[PDB]
Amino acid sequence: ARHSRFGGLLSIQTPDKTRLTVSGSQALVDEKIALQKLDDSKKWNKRIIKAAEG
Amino acid sequence: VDDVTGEKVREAFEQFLEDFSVQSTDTGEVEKVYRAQIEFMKIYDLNTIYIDYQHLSMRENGALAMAISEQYYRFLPFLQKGLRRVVRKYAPELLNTSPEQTERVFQISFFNLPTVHRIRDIRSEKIGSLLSISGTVTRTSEVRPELYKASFTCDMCRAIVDNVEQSFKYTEPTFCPNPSCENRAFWTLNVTRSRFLDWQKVRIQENANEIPTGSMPRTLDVILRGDSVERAKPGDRCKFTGVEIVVPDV
Amino acid sequence: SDEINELKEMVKDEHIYDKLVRSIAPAVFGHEAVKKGILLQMLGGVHKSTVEGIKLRGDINICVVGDPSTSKSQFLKYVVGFAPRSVYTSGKASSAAGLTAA
Amino acid sequence: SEPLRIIWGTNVSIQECTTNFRNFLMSFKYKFRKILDEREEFINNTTDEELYYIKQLNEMRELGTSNLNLDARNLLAYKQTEDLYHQLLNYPQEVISIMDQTIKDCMVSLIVDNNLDYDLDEIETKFYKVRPYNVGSCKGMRELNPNDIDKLINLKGLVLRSTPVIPDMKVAFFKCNVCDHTMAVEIDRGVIQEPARCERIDCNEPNSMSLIHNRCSFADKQVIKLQETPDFVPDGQTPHSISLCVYDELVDSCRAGDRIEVTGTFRSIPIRANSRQRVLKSLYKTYVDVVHVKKVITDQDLAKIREVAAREDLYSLLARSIAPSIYELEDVKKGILLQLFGGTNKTFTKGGRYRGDINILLCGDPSTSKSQILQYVHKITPRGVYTSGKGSSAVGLTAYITLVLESGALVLSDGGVCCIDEFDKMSDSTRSVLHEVMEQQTISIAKAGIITTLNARSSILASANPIGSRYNPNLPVTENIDLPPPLLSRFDLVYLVLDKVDEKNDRELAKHLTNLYLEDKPEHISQDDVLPVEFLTMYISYAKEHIHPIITEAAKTELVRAYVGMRKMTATTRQLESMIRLAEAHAKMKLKNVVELEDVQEAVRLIRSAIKDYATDPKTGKIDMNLV
DNA sequence: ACACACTCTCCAATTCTCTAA
DNA sequence: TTAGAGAATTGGAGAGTGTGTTTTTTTTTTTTTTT
């Protein structure tokens, strides 16, 4: 609802008391989105394989 | 990837141009005014067509008019494609502008929209929609040629690139198309093969009788193209229609 | 066609000149002389030039002088509210650059 | 047990804040606030037991509206939210977001639980926002310190200027150059998260996506310049200013010269050394991010207004109540009251528009308390300006070229009253500007690069002393006043006030002024029965909005007769129009819809009384001081 | 000399193919 | 059918190179000499 620079900060604590950090205002309320957004930052993808011509 | 809404709007606007089928001003006989307008254009080698928004409002329960109104910037190319086919069907003499003749750049125009906004009512939620505005003209620019489609040729080898698309900044090719050469530099723009448009900037301010209490008049910059340049005059009062856009820091 | 008919009908009238003078600035009481002057300025004379190339002025300039509450500014307000090409300016709040060009 | 969500750096849990605010929102009733208030005796048992916020939410649904006001004191009244009040001030960005997503869910719950006909999709589509206010004590603009960063603040001040609306991007739109795949991307922290490769499976290529400017989505931003109120400025110094950033709903709310109170987070940000590189400066910029703005009805109000309007002593009651501590000067007070009400505004299809506003001039001896009266008018009026003769230029009084145009005093004062003091000190050059603005209520300008006309529905209240600085009875009145006739003809009322010696008057005046020093902070006041300023303001405002008197035939006959009486003998044609305008102002003050004979006769009487006409020699124009 | 844009190069990570138990 | 030995293809780490940077009004308030 509110603009792109209003946003606060969120911390999420796991079992064994370790903590993660994610940004944005919807992450405050939606854990499904926070979990998905957390993994989405990570850089790598495995490179991929590939039948007809003429 | 292909946009189904665009193709359906295209071939629905096609049917509207074919068969709007209003009756005569004097009699109960079908007249088909937009086909007649195309014939008129053929008679005088014109390049623009005028459409009445009320005629579009009553067509097919209004959904077509809504799509054109709220998402003009998405659908304008599809409307052009729709009109090209009809003019081909009934007046192929209009498709061209002796050696070969380049294609005519048709212009669709609309009028009699439901309401007129003030310059003070322009807000970022309406970007890309279809609107109408009014004010007093205060300045006008001289007519300048704008590059519409470009064509380039390589210096290091005899190769040519064609139909490059510009948008807001002057734009050039990414590779040499001949794989026997790798030079990206030293392109030159072929002025004969490329195509231009007429372009004019004008500036307007709010009507004096409309200014709210204790306030002062705001201003706006407007773009005119094609057969509508030099139509406006400083100090006159005018009404405009088109779409509001957003321009970058080039 | 109806515009032409109406125009022809009022053109044909015997008393057209008096009605035209009477129809300038409807809200102002009396002062028929100024109203007649305004009508003639609005219509204007005929522009022309001589064989020598000198031009002869074809138009009319008017000035109104009066002591206070004489409603003299109402004539200017009517003229600028009616005439197709017109501008209103106050002698105090304007500059030579703003009057001619800048 | 399970992973938890924690506000960064706090160990505050979002679950508790959510549940507590839900309980407050769905069970608060206004009676609790009255428990915190001074007496239970105030309570209206029938009304105050109602679920206040459920009522508000039902209204939001049925009126089709998106924003909810919330004064923060209610969080202290309900026991479950006493700590949420502090957490709001210390962590606004997170807490406000929590409140927003609570309100939207509650609105959905109402329609699905009460199983109503309203479209669920419509409510899901909308955004809902809380706007907290009345947070605490106001803070001086110079006393904000670096330990206040990112906390909620409250400020009072005056608005200087507003920039035009700026488009602010919120969603980016990408399109693949080769295969025409498209993606919409979310903007956060100002950075566009552009994809590395085109995401279509068979077109997995680098540098393949591109941005399309006019298919993005934007939002409105605006910047307002707020100035420090003179009440707080340090000794021997000039006021400062601060900049407010405002978004969406609140964008075009406020004009130059407005007086407001605001509420928002106090923010700070870095600034770059150059546009080429990431190098930042050590000093940080600061600003305010507003979430609410406030300006500084009921059947009971209408009942009170109608009941007061029925009093017999109404005209004297209202007049003596605009300036309670000033002794006598009743006719001056009456004329000022009628200026406050004003006439009626009129516009024709042709023949123009006619001003409703009244212009007044106060002229006479020194020490007569003229300037003290101007203070009361300046504080009573909703909009207006006070200024001095030697303080004003022609440009400053009307409008200023700066290429942009800027507003002066008479433009800021539009629809209000402009108080001008030491009117006899300003030059003929500066005073000549007032002719056009007073007659037409418009300002025409024609200078290099700008030519236009502006509206000025502004009432002038003027103060001056005669030539020779004390009224000379050996000169005629027009020569003592000494304004030129084209300007003196433009005032509706002209008052002579005279410092005449009299033991009866002097004992009363001396007792009145000395009584103010019998107490440290006086409770004493000149009269037993006067109306409070708030209620008086309500009466005047309502009467201006709802009442529009018309001329009766009887009033027409009396006005023609009276004008011919003053004329046949000097009365100009403006005496007629000002009489009409005064009679209309008198009619509004009684909440009548018609002008009657009584109103016309009062308008005539007040004009004759103001300029001491009865004491005037009809042939020589001098005043017999013995008759005063 | 200090952040940047762009080019070049080598090395090992990866998947594919063939052989025999 | 599993698995392990050998060959080919690709990614990007990271090293290198070249580059850019400091720096005639027109309108409006105020002091001063000139008729």
Ligand SMILES: Nc1ncnc2c1ncn2[C@@H]1O[C@H](COP(=O)(O)OP(=O)(O)NP(=O)(O)O)[C@@H](O)[C@H]1O
């Ligand atoms: N009738 C009065 N009621 C109350 N105070 C009064 C009255 N007459 C005089 N005074 C006092 O006398 C002083 C008048 O000051 P002021 O308001 O400046 O008068 P003034 O008409 O503006 N005189 P001046 O500025 O010299 O032209 C103030 O202290 C007033 O409180």
Ligand SMILES: [Mg+2]
């Ligand atoms: Mg005073």
Ligand SMILES: [Zn+2]
């Ligand atoms: Zn080449």
Ligand SMILES: [Zn+2]
């Ligand atoms: Zn692609």
